[PDB]
Design a protein around this ligand. Structure first.
Ligand code: RET
Ligand code: OLA
Ligand code: OLA
Ligand code: OLA
Ligand code: OLA
Ligand code: OLA
Ligand code: CL
Ligand code: CL
Length: 264
């Protein structure tokens, strides 16, 4: 039912997909390490934001690692191309982890926006359920990518629905609590949000490849966009949130934070 299952890949598309996935594993487990290291440069009041990008890097990596092995498991060169075997490839696990990495990405944003008390857990919930409502409805849509573009669209429509509302929440929070930000970081955070806007919007694009390019080069397209989307929303976004967590820590009087940026 995945459109990946429909085609016999030329040797260069397979190998391209495989490297897409493997290099994805590489970069997540690599920022993973960096985040760990700079965790000591963040004050106790902001340390969970870097800690959450580590869960994302390992969540993202192990899923990408799962998919890479699964890629090569499912396919064998037969008779001039890579042909599906008795195992199948699927994007489904991308989704489930998005069920999981997205809450982490929001809490860390909400964290560096300086939300204490019932504000942050109340906003955290509405954003997860909206986000979760986006992912779940997108999943059921992508169950029909082969069999019913009709449903892929309407489920796609419901999902994007959720995307708009959830993005509306985030930005309202950014602009208000921007005030409370230390270190020139009020500026940076608004750039955090444009980054996510773009990054996140490549995923819908990647979900409509079946209706405008049901062919094997569409497979690779989709995997390319996912790879870019994942690097932007996960890795690069994490570094920016890392950047803001330390800058405030130093403004607040975390000596190990001033030390770190004072070295540069
Ligand atoms: C790992 C982090 C992120 C932010 C991946 C997020 C995925 C989206 C923002 C995708 C939204 C989609 C839409 C809006 C519609 C079709 C189903 C999707 C979930 C792909
Ligand atoms: C084994 C996978 C094949 C690809 C090799 C991967 C090489 C990794 C290169 C750098 C990691 C990308 C993230 C940049 C480093 C984050 C630290 C920083 O610049 O602040
Ligand atoms: C490869 C990884 C082995 C080292 C893991 C990162 C070192 C952590 C040291 C530290 O900052 O406490
Ligand atoms: C929460 C769920 C809210 C409404 C979902 C209704 C729209 C999707 C139904 C599409 C399935 C179908 O086409 O039969
Ligand atoms: C900032 C996110 C960047 C993520 C890195 C993705 C790297 C892709 C590299 C360039 C793609 C151009 C190579 C052309 C692919 C050949 C397609 C084919 O074999 O049919
Ligand atoms: C051309 C390629 C684009 C460059 C790579 C983008 C790097 C990731 C952003 C990570 C955080 C950057 C620190 C920001 C310091 C500042 O904004 O003043
Ligand atoms: Cl603190
Ligand atoms: Cl993930």
């Amino acid at each position: 039912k995945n459109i990946e299952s429909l085609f016999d890949y030329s040797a260069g598309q397979f190998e391209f997909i495989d490297h897409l996935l493997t290099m994805g594993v590489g970069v997540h487990f690599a920022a993973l390490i960096f985040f760990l290291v700079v965790s000591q440069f963040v004050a106790p009041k902001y340390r969970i934001a870097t800690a959450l990008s580590c869960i994302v890097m390992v969540s993202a990596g192990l899923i990408l690692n799962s998919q890479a092995v699964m890629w090569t498991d499912a396919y064998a060169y037969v008779d001039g191309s890579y042909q599906l075997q008795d195992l199948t490839f699927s994007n489904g696990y991308r989704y489930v982890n998005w069920m999981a990495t997205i809450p982490c990405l929001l809490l860390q944003l909400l964290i560096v926006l300086n939300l204490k008390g019932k504000e942050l857990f109340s906003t955290a919930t509405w954003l997860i359920l909206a986000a979760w409502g986006m992912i779940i409805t997108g999943y059921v849509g992508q169950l029909y990518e082969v069999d019913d573009i009709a449903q892929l669209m309407i489920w796609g429509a419901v999902s994007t629905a959720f995307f708009v509302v959830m993005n509306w929440i985030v930005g309202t929070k950014i602009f208000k609590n921007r005030a409370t930000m230390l270190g020139g970081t009020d500026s940076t955070i608004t750039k955090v949000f444009w980054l996510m806007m773009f990054a996140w919007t490549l995923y819908p694009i990647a979900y409509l490849v079946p209706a405008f390019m049901n062919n094997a080069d569409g497979v690779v397209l989709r995997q390319l966009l996912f790879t870019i989307a994942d690097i932007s929303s996960k890795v690069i976004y994490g570094l920016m949130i890392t950047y803001i967590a330390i800058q405030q820590s130093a403004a607040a009087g975390y000596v190990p934070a001033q030390q770190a940026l004072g070295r540069i």
